[PDB]
C-alpha cells in the first residue's frame, strides 16, 4: 500500500490552463495538440460543470490506475505574472524520541482557483522529493491546509486523497498556511 501510494504520487502530472472542456455524462474530455484526455466527475464536481461545452477551464491531470478524476478548476481571470499568493509551508518530522525538526518555506499559489487534487498531490510529491515521504510507513501523518477563515482541508498521506474530493476547489487568495505533520 505504501509501496502503492509512492507509485501513484511519483506519476507525472499535467498542468493544462484555458482550454475547453466538454461534459458528455460524468465525463469532461479535453484535447491538447498532443492528447485527449477524459475526466471523471465523482463528487461535486457534478453539479457545476454543464452539459456540453464548458469554456476557460484549467485542469490537473494524473493518469489513473487516458482518463484522470477531478481537478477541472476556472481558469484565471487576469495573468498573473506575479504570484496570486504566498503560503507558509511547515513540515513536522519526527527523527526519532530523541529528535523533532521544522522546514519552514514558501509555498507560491499561481491559481485563484485550485482544486484540492493539485495541492494533495503536488505537496505530497514535494514531500517524497524532500522529507523521504513513503521511505517509510505513513502512519497518522497528515497534510493540513489553513484558510484565512479558519476553515481547513485534510489529506491524510496513509491514503489516495478521495475520489470525490479530487474536484473540490478553493480560493487560492484565501490560503493562510499548510502543514504536515511527518
Ligand atoms: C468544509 C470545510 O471547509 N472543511 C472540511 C473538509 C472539506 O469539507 C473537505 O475536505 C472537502 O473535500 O472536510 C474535512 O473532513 C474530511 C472528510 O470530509 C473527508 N471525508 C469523509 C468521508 C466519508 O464520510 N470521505 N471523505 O475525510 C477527510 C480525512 O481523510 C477529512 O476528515 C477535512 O478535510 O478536514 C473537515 C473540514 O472541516
Redesign the pocket.
Given at each position: 500500500a505504501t509501496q502503492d501510494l509512492s507509485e501513484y504520487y511519483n506519476r507525472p502530472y499535467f498542468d493544462l490552463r484555458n482550454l475547453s472542456g466538454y461534459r458528455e455524462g460524468n465525463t469532461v474530455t479535453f484535447i491538447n495538440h498532443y492528447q485527449q484526455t477524459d475526466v471523471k466527475l465523482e463528487?461535486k464536481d457534478k453539479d457545476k460543470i454543464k452539459d456540453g461545452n464548458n469554456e476557460n477551464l484549467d485542469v490537473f491531470v494524473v493518469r489513473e490506475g487516458n482518463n484522470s478524476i477531478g481537478g477541472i478548476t476556472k481558469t484565471n481571470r487576469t495573468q498573473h505574472i506575479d504570484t496570486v499568493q504566498n503560503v507558509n509551508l511547515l513540515v513536522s518530522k519526527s527523527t526519532g524520541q530523541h529528535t523533532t525538526s521544522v522546514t519552514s518555506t514558501n509555498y507560491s499559489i499561481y491559481k485563484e482557483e485550485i482544486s484540492?487534487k493539485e495541492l494533495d498531490f503536488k505537496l505530497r510529491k514535494h514531500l517524497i522529493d524532500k522529507h523521504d515521504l513513503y521511505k517509510t510507513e505513513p502512519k497518522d501523518s497528515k497534510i493540513?491546509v489553513t484558510?484565512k477563515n479558519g476553515?481547513?482541508?485534510?489529506?491524510?498521506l496513509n491514503?489516495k486523497l478521495?475520489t470525490?474530493?479530487m474536484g473540490?476547489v478553493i480560493d487560492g487568495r484565501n490560503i493562510e498556511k499548510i502543514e504536515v505533520n511527518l
Open positions: 463528487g484540492l493540513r484558510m476553515d481547513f482541508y485534510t489529506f491524510e491514503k478521495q470525490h474530493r473540490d
